[PDB]
Design an enzyme around this catalytic site. Structure first.
Site, PDB file in Angstrom:
ATOM      1  N   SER A  45       0.738  -1.258   0.000  1.00 61.08           N
ATOM      2  CA  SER A  45       0.000   0.000   0.000  1.00 61.08           C
ATOM      3  C   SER A  45       0.783   1.334   0.000  1.00 61.08           C
ATOM      4  CB  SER A  45      -0.987  -0.016   1.180  1.00 61.08           C
ATOM      5  OG  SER A  45      -1.967  -1.020   0.937  1.00 61.08           O
ATOM      6  N   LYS A  48       0.018   3.791  -2.865  1.00 62.66           N
ATOM      7  CA  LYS A  48      -1.132   4.671  -2.950  1.00 62.66           C
ATOM      8  C   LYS A  48      -0.760   6.157  -2.936  1.00 62.66           C
ATOM      9  CE  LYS A  48      -3.887   0.884  -1.157  1.00 62.66           C
ATOM     10  NZ  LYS A  48      -4.425   0.124   0.028  1.00 62.66           N
ATOM     11  N   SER A 105      -6.110   3.407   3.598  1.00 61.59           N
ATOM     12  CA  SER A 105      -5.533   2.349   2.773  1.00 61.59           C
ATOM     13  C   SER A 105      -6.634   1.516   2.080  1.00 61.59           C
ATOM     14  CB  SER A 105      -4.649   1.436   3.643  1.00 61.59           C
ATOM     15  OG  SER A 105      -3.623   0.790   2.894  1.00 61.59           O
ATOM     16  N   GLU A 141      -5.108  -4.137  -6.994  1.00 64.16           N
ATOM     17  CA  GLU A 141      -5.357  -4.693  -5.667  1.00 64.16           C
ATOM     18  C   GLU A 141      -6.298  -5.864  -5.923  1.00 64.16           C
ATOM     19  OE1 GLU A 141      -4.112  -4.033  -2.922  1.00 64.16           O
ATOM     20  OE2 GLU A 141      -3.339  -1.982  -2.947  1.00 64.16           O
ATOM     21  N   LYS A 209       2.513   6.745   5.244  1.00 62.22           N
ATOM     22  CA  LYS A 209       1.682   5.756   4.567  1.00 62.22           C
ATOM     23  C   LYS A 209       2.341   4.393   4.797  1.00 62.22           C
ATOM     24  CE  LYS A 209      -1.743   4.104   2.340  1.00 62.22           C
ATOM     25  NZ  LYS A 209      -1.548   3.010   3.351  1.00 62.22           N
ATOM     26  N   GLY A 211       2.228  -0.047   4.787  1.00 59.93           N
ATOM     27  CA  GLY A 211       1.873  -1.110   3.861  1.00 59.93           C
ATOM     28  C   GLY A 211       2.021  -2.466   4.527  1.00 59.93           C
ATOM     29  N   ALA A 212       1.219  -3.425   4.070  1.00 54.56           N
ATOM     30  CA  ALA A 212       1.286  -4.787   4.575  1.00 54.56           C
ATOM     31  C   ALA A 212       0.979  -5.698   3.398  1.00 54.56           C
ATOM     32  CB  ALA A 212       0.267  -5.005   5.686  1.00 54.56           C
TER      33      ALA A 212
HETATM   34  B1  105 Z   1      -2.000  -2.038   2.042  1.00 55.94           B
HETATM   35  O1  105 Z   1      -2.294  -1.370   3.337  1.00 55.94           O
HETATM   36  O2  105 Z   1      -0.694  -2.716   2.120  1.00 55.94           O
HETATM   37  C1  105 Z   1      -3.126  -3.098   1.723  1.00 55.94           C
HETATM   38  N1  105 Z   1      -3.636  -3.768   2.938  1.00 55.94           N
HETATM   39  C2  105 Z   1      -4.580  -4.708   2.812  1.00 55.94           C
HETATM   40  O3  105 Z   1      -4.988  -4.990   1.681  1.00 55.94           O
HETATM   41  C3  105 Z   1      -5.179  -5.459   4.031  1.00 55.94           C
HETATM   42  C4  105 Z   1      -5.802  -6.615   4.005  1.00 55.94           C
HETATM   43  C5  105 Z   1      -5.980  -7.425   2.746  1.00 55.94           C
HETATM   44  O4  105 Z   1      -6.289  -7.070   5.190  1.00 55.94           O
HETATM   45  N2  105 Z   1      -5.871  -5.968   6.131  1.00 55.94           N
HETATM   46  C6  105 Z   1      -5.220  -5.072   5.408  1.00 55.94           C
HETATM   47  C7  105 Z   1      -4.610  -3.854   6.030  1.00 55.94           C
HETATM   48  C8  105 Z   1      -3.518  -3.996   6.951  1.00 55.94           C
HETATM   49 CL1  105 Z   1      -2.859  -5.557   7.278  1.00 55.94          CL
HETATM   50  C9  105 Z   1      -2.974  -2.860   7.610  1.00 55.94           C
HETATM   51  C10 105 Z   1      -3.509  -1.573   7.350  1.00 55.94           C
HETATM   52  C11 105 Z   1      -4.587  -1.420   6.430  1.00 55.94           C
HETATM   53  C12 105 Z   1      -5.137  -2.559   5.769  1.00 55.94           C
END
Ligand code: 105
Length: 263
Positions: A45, A48, A105, A141, A209, A211-212
Site C-alpha cells: 500500500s 497509494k 488504505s 489490488e 503511509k 503497507g502490509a
Molecule cells: B495495504 O495497506 O498494504 C493493503 N492492505 C490490505 O490490503 C489489508 C488486508 C488485505 O487485510 N488488512 C489489510 C490492512 C492492513 Cl494488514 C494494515 C492496514 C490497512 C489494511
C-alpha cells in the site's frame, strides 16, 4: 546515526528476514543513513501515495477534477474496502477516493483511482517520467501484495521510494496547492498508529503511509521532523518474515524510536 543501524540489523535478526532502510534529508536530498538501500521490496500500500501524486499531476494539468464523482458497484469491491464499501449508492469524488486510499488504505479506492489514470502501466510511466526508473506497479489490488520472493513486479527500493517522495513533496512536479493536499492526506493517515507514530515525540510532524502484504511484508514511508515541520524522509521495508503482525510493527516502531533518539 550508526546506532540506528544497530537496531535495523537487530530487526533483521529478530524477524529472520530482510529489512531495507533509508533516512533522507528533505531539503538537500542527502542520504543520512541506509541499509540495503538499493534492494527491491514489495511496495504494498505505500504505492497509494504515488498513485494520488499522479492523480494530482493530472488535476494540475486540467486532465482531472478533484470534485469529479466516480460511481462503482459491488462488483468492484475487493478485500479491505472500509470506506468505499459504504458508498456504493452515491459513489465518491476523486478527492474522497485519495483520502480513503491514503488515510485508510482502502483497496477499492486505489483500484478506482488507478483506473482513472490508465492503470499500473501509466503510474509506472508517470514515475519513469519524473526520474524514478526503479519503482514499478504491475498489478491491481489485491494481487500486487503477493510479495513473491525475487519477483520485481510491484516493487521499489528504499532509495528509489525516498527520492521519489522527496520530489513529490518538495519538487516543482506538483503545484503548491497539490503538494499540500498530498501531505495533508498523509498527515491524516489513520491505520499506521503502532508504527513510527508510536515513537513520535509530542509536537513533531509526520505524514506517512504504511503497507502490509503476504509473506511477512510490512513497510512505511514518511516525512517527519520537530516543531510541526518535516525535515527528513524515512522509508522502511521488510519481506520474508514468519513473524506476527505485532512483532513486525514493534521492530519498525523501535527503528523509529532509535532514529528519533539520535536525530
Ligand atoms: B495495504 O495497506 O498494504 C493493503 N492492505 C490490505 O490490503 C489489508 C488486508 C488485505 O487485510 N488488512 C489489510 C490492512 C492492513 Cl494488514 C494494515 C492496514 C490497512 C489494511
Amino acid at each position: 546515526h550508526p546506532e540506528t543501524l544497530v537496531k535495523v540489523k537487530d530487526a533483521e535478526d529478530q524477524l529472520g528476514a530482510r529489512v531495507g532502510y533509508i533516512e533522507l534529508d528533505l531539503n538537500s536530498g542527502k542520504i543520512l543513513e541506509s541499509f540495503r538501500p538499493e534492494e527491491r521490496f514489495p511496495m504494498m500500500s505505500t504505492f497509494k501515495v504515488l498513485l494520488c501524486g499522479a492523480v494530482l499531476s493530472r488535476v494540475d494539468a486540467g486532465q482531472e477534477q478533484l470534485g469529479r464523482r466516480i460511481h462503482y458497484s459491488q462488483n468492484d469491491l475487493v478485500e479491505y474496502s472500509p470506506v468505499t464499501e459504504k458508498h456504493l449508492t452515491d459513489g465518491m469524488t476523486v478527492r474522497e477516493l485519495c483520502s480513503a486510499a491514503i488515510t485508510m488504505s482502502d483497496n477499492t479506492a486505489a483500484n478506482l483511482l488507478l483506473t482513472t489514470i490508465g492503470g499500473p502501466k501509466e503510474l509506472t510511466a508517470f514515475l519513469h517520467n519524473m526520474g524514478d526508473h526503479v519503482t514499478r506497479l504491475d498489478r491491481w489490488e489485491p494481487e500486487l501484495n503477493e510479495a513473491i520472493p525475487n519477483d520485481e513486479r510491484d516493487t521499489t527500493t528504499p532509495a528509489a521510494m525516498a527520492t521519489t517522495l522527496r520530489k513529490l513533496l518538495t519538487g516543482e512536479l506538483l503545484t503548491l496547492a497539490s503538494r499540500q493536499q498530498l501531505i495533508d492526506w498523509m498527515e491524516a493517515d489513520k491505520v499506521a498508529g503502532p508504527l513510527l507514530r508510536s515513537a513520535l515525540p509530542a509536537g513533531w510532524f509526520i505524514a506517512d503511509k504504511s503497507g502490509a502484504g503476504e509473506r511477512g511484508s510490512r513497510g512505511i514511508i514518511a516525512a517527519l521532523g520537530p516543531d510541526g515541520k518535516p525535515s527528513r524522509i524515512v522509508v522502511i521495508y521488510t519481506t520474508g518474515s514468519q513473524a506476527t503482525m505485532d512483532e513486525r510493527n514493534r521492530q519498525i516502531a523501535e527503528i523509529g524510536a532509535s532514529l528519533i533518539k539520535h536525530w
